[PDB]
Amino acid sequence: VQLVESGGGLVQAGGSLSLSCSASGRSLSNYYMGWFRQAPGKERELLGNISWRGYNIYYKDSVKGRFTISRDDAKNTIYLQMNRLKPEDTAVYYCAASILPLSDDPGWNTYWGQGTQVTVS
Amino acid sequence: VQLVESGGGLVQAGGSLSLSCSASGRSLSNYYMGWFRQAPGKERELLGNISWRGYNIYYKDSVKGRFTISRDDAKNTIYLQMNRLKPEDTAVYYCAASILPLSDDPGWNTYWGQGTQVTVS
Amino acid sequence: VQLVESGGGLVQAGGSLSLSCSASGRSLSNYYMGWFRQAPGKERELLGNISWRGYNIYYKDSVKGRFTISRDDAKNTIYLQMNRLKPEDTAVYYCAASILPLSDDPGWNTYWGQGTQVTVS
Amino acid sequence: DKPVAHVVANPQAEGQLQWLNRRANALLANGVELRDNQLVVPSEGLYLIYSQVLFKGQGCPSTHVLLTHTISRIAVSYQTKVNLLSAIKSPCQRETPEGAEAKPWYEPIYLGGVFQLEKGDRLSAEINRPDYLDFAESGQVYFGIIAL
Amino acid sequence: DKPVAHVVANPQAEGQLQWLNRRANALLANGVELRDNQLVVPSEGLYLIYSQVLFKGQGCPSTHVLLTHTISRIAVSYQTKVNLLSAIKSPCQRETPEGAEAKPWYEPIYLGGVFQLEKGDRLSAEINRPDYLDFAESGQVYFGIIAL
Amino acid sequence: DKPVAHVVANPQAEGQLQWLNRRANALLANGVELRDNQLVVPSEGLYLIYSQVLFKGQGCPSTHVLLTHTISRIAVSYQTKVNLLSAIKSPCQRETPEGAEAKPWYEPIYLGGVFQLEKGDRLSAEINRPDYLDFAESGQVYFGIIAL
Numbered sequence: 001v002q003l004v005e006s007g008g009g010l011v012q013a014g015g016s017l018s019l020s021c022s023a024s025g026r027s028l029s030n031y032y033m034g035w036f037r038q039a040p041g042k043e044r045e046l047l048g049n050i051s052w053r054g055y056n057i058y059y060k061d062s063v064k065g066r067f068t069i070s071r072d073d074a075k076n077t078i079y080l081q082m083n084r085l086k087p088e089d090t091a092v093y094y095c096a097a098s099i100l101p102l103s104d105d106p107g108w109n110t111y112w113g114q115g116t117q118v119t120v121s
Numbered sequence: 122v123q124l125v126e127s128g129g130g131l132v133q134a135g136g137s138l139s140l141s142c143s144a145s146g147r148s149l150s151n152y153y154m155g156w157f158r159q160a161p162g163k164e165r166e167l168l169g170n171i172s173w174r175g176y177n178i179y180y181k182d183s184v185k186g187r188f189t190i191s192r193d194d195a196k197n198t199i200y201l202q203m204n205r206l207k208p209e210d211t212a213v214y215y216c217a218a219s220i221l222p223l224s225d226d227p228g229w230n231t232y233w234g235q236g237t238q239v240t241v242s
Numbered sequence: 243v244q245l246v247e248s249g250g251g252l253v254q255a256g257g258s259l260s261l262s263c264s265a266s267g268r269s270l271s272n273y274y275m276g277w278f279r280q281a282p283g284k285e286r287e288l289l290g291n292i293s294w295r296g297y298n299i300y301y302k303d304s305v306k307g308r309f310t311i312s313r314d315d316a317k318n319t320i321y322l323q324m325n326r327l328k329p330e331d332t333a334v335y336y337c338a339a340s341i342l343p344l345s346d347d348p349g350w351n352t353y354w355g356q357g358t359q360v361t362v363s
Numbered sequence: 364d365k366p367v368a369h370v371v372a373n374p375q376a377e378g379q380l381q382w383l384n385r386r387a388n389a390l391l392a393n394g395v396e397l398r399d400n401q402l403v404v405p406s407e408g409l410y411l412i413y414s415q416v417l418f419k420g421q422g423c424p425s426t427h428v429l430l431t432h433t434i435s436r437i438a439v440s441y442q443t444k445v446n447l448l449s450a451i452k453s454p455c456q457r458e459t460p461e462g463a464e465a466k467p468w469y470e471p472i473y474l475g476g477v478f479q480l481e482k483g484d485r486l487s488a489e490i491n492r493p494d495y496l497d498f499a500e501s502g503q504v505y506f507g508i509i510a511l
Numbered sequence: 512d513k514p515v516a517h518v519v520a521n522p523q524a525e526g527q528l529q530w531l532n533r534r535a536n537a538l539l540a541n542g543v544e545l546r547d548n549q550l551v552v553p554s555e556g557l558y559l560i561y562s563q564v565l566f567k568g569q570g571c572p573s574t575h576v577l578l579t580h581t582i583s584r585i586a587v588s589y590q591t592k593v594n595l596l597s598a599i600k601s602p603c604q605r606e607t608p609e610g611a612e613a614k615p616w617y618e619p620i621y622l623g624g625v626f627q628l629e630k631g632d633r634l635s636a637e638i639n640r641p642d643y644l645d646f647a648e649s650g651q652v653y654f655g656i657i658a659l
Numbered sequence: 660d661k662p663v664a665h666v667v668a669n670p671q672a673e674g675q676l677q678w679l680n681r682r683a684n685a686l687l688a689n690g691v692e693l694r695d696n697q698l699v700v701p702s703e704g705l706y707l708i709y710s711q712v713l714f715k716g717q718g719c720p721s722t723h724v725l726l727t728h729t730i731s732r733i734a735v736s737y738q739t740k741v742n743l744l745s746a747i748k749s750p751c752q753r754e755t756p757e758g759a760e761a762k763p764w765y766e767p768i769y770l771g772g773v774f775q776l777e778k779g780d781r782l783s784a785e786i787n788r789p790d791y792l793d794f795a796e797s798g799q800v801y802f803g804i805i806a807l
Contacts, residue, residue, distance in 0.1 A: 349500030
C-alpha cells in the first residue's frame, strides 16, 4: 500500500487548511486510513482514522470539534479539514494506513505517506 | 430450508395427537429441528428440539413427560407426540429449524413452518 | 507417522547409553518427538520431548542433568543420551511423536515406537 | 471458596458430547452440579462462562457442513431457553476431488463471557455435529463456569 | 458488586457494529458506562476484557478480504490510543470459480485478556469490515469487561 | 492484590516466541514470575489461564502444515507434564498456489480456562511451529494467568 499526501504549507493562526491522501494498492477496503502529526522536538501523535465506508471514526480529544476526517472510497482518498488552526498545530502531517485501527504505538503493519509540512502563524 | 407441518385440527381433551414436520433443503444434518407453540394470549414458547441423530434433545418443563419429539434422518422429518391433551394445549404449533439450538428468542437464522392449528375439546 | 528405536541393552550401573529413534511420514516438522519409559509393575512416565529445530525442550525432573535429548531434522531422528545409569532406570523406553506436546496423559493423536529394553546392573 | 466447574469431553462416549468432571485437571465444586449434561447454577450472581470445542475431518464431503457451538441458558424462573454465546464455522468450501487424498482439517471454537445467572439455571455447551468433534487428546474440548 | 459489562451487537443497526446493553442476558453495571459505542472504565484496577465477533459471507470475491477485530484503549491520562488485543483472519484463499455455488462461510474471532486500566479509559471493540458481521442470532457478537 | 500475568511476545526476538512483561499494557505481579519463558504459579488456588497466538504465512507450501498451540502444566508435586488447553489449525487445506503468486493467510488461536494449580507449577504456552508466528503489531500474541 502506497500513500501520497497533498496540501499543506502555510496558514495564518485562526485560519483553515485541507490535506488529502491518495492510496494505491490491492483491497484498500481492508484498511483504516488516517492522520498522524509530529511537531519539532515533540512525540508523534495519532489525530484520527476512518475505515472503509466511514464505519469507524476516531479523533484525538485535542483536535475533536475543529478537525474533520472524511473518505472517498471510489477515489481511495482521505481528507483532513483543519479549522481554527493554532501555532501548536505546526507539524509535519503524515497519512497512515493499517488493517488494524491506527495507534499511538504503530507497528510494522502500518504504511506511511511522505509527510506534509503545515506551519501556523 | 423449507418446513411443512401436518396433523392437527380438532381433538378431544384427554386424547392424543401426533404432528409431523418435513424438511427440504441442503445438508439438513446441520440443523436442530423442533417445535414452538403460541396459545391465545400466551407468549410464543419453545416446546423442544432434536438435532441430527437425536444427540441433543430439549423439552420445556411444562410439556416434559407428555410430549415426545422424535426424528427420522432418512425422511428428514420430526414428530411431536402429544399425549393427555388438555384445553390449555389449544394453540398454533410451529415447526422450526436452525443450525443453532432453538431458543425462546429466535433470530434470522431460524426457519419456520406454516403453523398448524390444534383445538382441544 | 512410524517410529523405530535402536540403542537399548544391558549396561552396568554408573554406565552410559544412547538411544536413537528414526521417524518416517509426512511433514514431521509438525511433531514434538520424545521419550517415555515403563518398568514392569511401575507407572508409565514421560522423560522428555523436543519439537522441530529444538524450540521446545522438556525433561522430567528425575532425569534432568543426566539425560540429554537432541534432534536431527535432516535425518528426522531423535537421540536420548543417558549418563550415570542407575538400577531404577531399568525399563522399556518408547519413542513417541505428537503434533501436541507429549504428556503424562497421552491421547489418540500420539504415535509410538516398538520400544527398546534398557537393563541396568 | 466459590462455585466452580471445568468439565471435559468424555472420549469414552462415541459420537456424542458428554461432559465429565471425574478426571484430573477438571472441576465441579462449591455447589456447581452436572445434571443431564448441563451445569446447574448453585446461587444467584455473576459467572464467567467458557467453552472450547475442537472439530476435525478427513477431507471435505459433498454436503456443505456448518459446525456450530453454543452455550445455552435454561432460566428456571421463566422456563425459557436462550443462546448466551454462539459461534459458527464452515470448514470446507469444495469437496475433496476423487484421487486427491482427503487431508485432515481442524477447527477450534472458543466461547467466553460474563453473565448474571439465577440459582437453578441450567447451562448447556451444545454442538450441531458431534460426529466432527475431536477428543483424541485431553485439553481440546471443555466447558466451565466460575462465580465472580 | 464489581464493575461489569457484557454488551451485544444491535440487530436493529443495519450493516454496522453498535453495542447494546438494554437486552436480556446483557450487562452494564457498577460504574461501567457505554458512551459513543465505547466502554468507559469507572475505576483504576485489573480488568478481564473480552470480545467476540462472527463474520459471514456468500462465496469469495476477487478482492483478498482480511477481516480484523481489535480491542483498543484510549488512555485518558496520556491521550493515547493503542490496540490491546487484535486478531486477523483470511476467509478466502481462492475466489469462487466460474458460475460456482456461492457457498456461505463463517469466521468467528475471540479476543480476551487481563489489563491494568485507569478511571476514564475508553475501550472499543473495532472491526475493519462491519459489512461482513453476522448478528442474525443472539450470542454471536459481544464485548465485555469485568473488574477483578 | 491477586496473582497476575499478561506477558506479550517480544517483537525484538526474531522467528521465536519469547515472553515479555517489561512493556506498557503487560502484567507480572503479586508473586507471579516469568522464568525460562514460563509462568511459575506462586500459590495454590484457582487460576484463569489464557493465551492467544496469531499465525501468518505467504501462500501454501508442499508440506501439510498443522499449527498447534497449547498451555501445558508441569505439576511439581508429581513431576508430571500435561496439556491443560490445546488447539490445532490446518492453514492450508491442500490449496497450494500452483501457477500464480501467493496471498497472505492469518490464523488466530485462543485458549482459556479455569484450573486448580499448586505453588511452584510451571505453565508453558507452546507452539509446534514458532516460525509461523506473527508479532508485527501489538496485541496479537499473549499469555496470562489470574488467581480467582
